[PDB]
Design a protein around this ligand. Structure first.
Ligand SMILES: NC(=O)c1ccc[n+]([C@@H]2C[C@H](COP(=O)(O)OP(=O)(O)OC[C@H]3O[C@@H](n4cnc5c(N)ncnc54)[C@H](O)[C@@H]3O)[C@@H](O)[C@H]2O)c1
Ligand SMILES: [Zn+2]
Lengths: 5, 267
C-alpha cells in the first residue's frame, strides 16, 4: 500500500 | 452522523477494543501545524512535494533542512489535552483488561511523549533515521542531528538552501557503512511497512469502537481504515474541526478542537 495524498 | 455525546458514551462504556486513528489535527493544539493550507508550506515549497523520494534523491540537503527544522520545532512541544485524554484512557481501560490502541499518521511522537503505549506509527517517526545503504533504523534525538544543520531549516520564503554537501549531511555510524541517512518517515509514493500494515489490519478487524481524530481522511491508505471498520457495522466517531470527505460514512461527528472534545468523550 502506497502512501498517497 | 450524530453529535450526541451521550450516545457515543454508551458505546464507549461497553467497548472492549477501541481503535483511535489520529492525524495532524491531534497535535495542532500543541503548536504543531498541520499541512492544511498554510502549514503545508515551507519556503516556496509544498510539504507534499518535499516529502517524496523524488525530492530527496535530487536534493537531500533541502529535504533534510525541512526535517531538521521540524525535529527542532518538535523539541519545545508538549502533548496537549487531546493526547493526554487518549493516553489516560488507555491506562484506565488497560487495568480493566480492555484495549485501546492508537494508529497515528503523525511522525511527531507526541502520543509517545504523552504516555500512550499501544501505538502504531504508520508513517514512521521524525526522531528515527534510516540508512539509505544498509537499511539500519536507529533512534535519533540529537540536536542538531548533524553540525552542518545548526541554525538551518528556516521556513521563510526566499531562504536560500544551506546546500550542505552530502558527506556532511547525517551519515550512518554503522561499522564500515558511512551511508547517507534519511528520516525514517514514509514519503508520498512510498510503501507503508507491510509488517505495520498487518498489525493495523488485526486491530481494525478485532475492534468494536473506532475514533478518528484530527485527520483529513484524504491520505491513503490510512483514509480507508475507519471507513472499513464502519463497513463492518462498528461505530465510528470523528473528532475534527471540520467535516471531511469521509464524514457521512461515520456514526458520530463531534466538531471542534479535539483538545476540548476528547477529554469529555474519553473520561
Ligand atoms: N504532527 C505531525 O506529526 C504532523 C504534522 C504535519 C503533517 N503530518 C502528516 C502529513 C500528512 C498530511 O498532513 P495534513 O494535510 O495536515 O493531513 P491530516 O490528515 O493530518 O489532516 C489534518 C486534519 O486535522 C484537522 N484539525 C486541525 N486542528 C484540529 C483540532 N484542533 N482538533 C481536531 N482536528 C483538527 C484538520 O481539519 C484536518 O482534518 C498526514 O499524514 C499528516 O499526519 C504530521
Ligand atoms: Zn548504513
Amino acid at each position: 500500500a502506497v502512501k498517497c495524498a | 452522523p450524530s453529535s450526541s455525546m451521550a450516545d457515543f458514551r454508551k458505546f464507549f462504556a461497553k467497548a472492549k477494543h477501541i481503535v483511535i486513528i489520529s492525524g495532524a489535527g491531534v497535535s495542532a493544539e500543541s503548536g504543531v501545524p498541520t499541512f492544511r493550507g498554510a502549514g503545508g508550506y515551507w519556503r516556496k515549497w509544498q510539504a507534499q512535494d518535499l516529502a517524496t523520494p523524488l525530492a530527496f534523491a535530487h536534493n537531500p540537503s533541502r529535504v533534510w533542512e525541512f526535517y531538521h527544522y521540524r525535529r527542532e520545532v518538535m523539541g519545545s512541544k508538549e502533548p496537549n489535552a487531546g493526547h493526554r485524554a487518549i493516553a489516560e484512557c488507555e491506562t484506565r481501560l488497560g487495568k480493566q483488561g480492555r484495549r485501546v490502541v492508537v494508529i497515528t499518521q503523525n511522525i511527531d511522537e507526541l502520543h509517545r511523549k504523552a504516555g500512550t503505549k499501544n501505538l502504531l506509527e504508520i508513517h514512521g517517526s521524525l526522531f528515527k533515521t534510516r540508512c539509505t545503504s544498509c537499511g539500519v533504523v536507529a533512534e535519533n534525538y540529537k540536536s542538531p542531528i548533524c553540525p552542518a544543520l545548526s541554525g538551518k531549516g528556516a521556513p521563510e520564503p526566499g531562504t536560500q538552501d544551506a546546500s550542505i554537501p552530502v558527506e556532511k549531511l547525517p551519515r550512518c555510524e554503522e561499522a564500515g557503512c558511512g551511508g547517507l541517512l534519511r528520516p525514517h518517515v514514509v514519503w508520498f509514493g512510498e510503501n507503508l511497512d507491510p509488517a505495520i500494515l498487518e498489525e493495523v489490519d488485526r486491530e481494525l478487524a478485532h475492534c468494536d469502537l473506532c475514533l478518528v481524530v484530527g485527520t483529513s481522511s484524504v491520505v491513503y491508505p490510512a483514509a480507508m481504515f475507519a471507513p472499513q471498520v464502519a463497513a463492518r457495522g462498528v461505530p465510528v466517531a470523528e473528532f475534527n474541526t471540520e467535516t471531511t470527505p469521509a464524514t457521512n460514512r461515520f456514526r458520530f461527528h463531534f466538531q471542534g478542537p479535539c483538545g476540548t472534545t476528547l477529554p469529555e468523550a474519553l473520561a
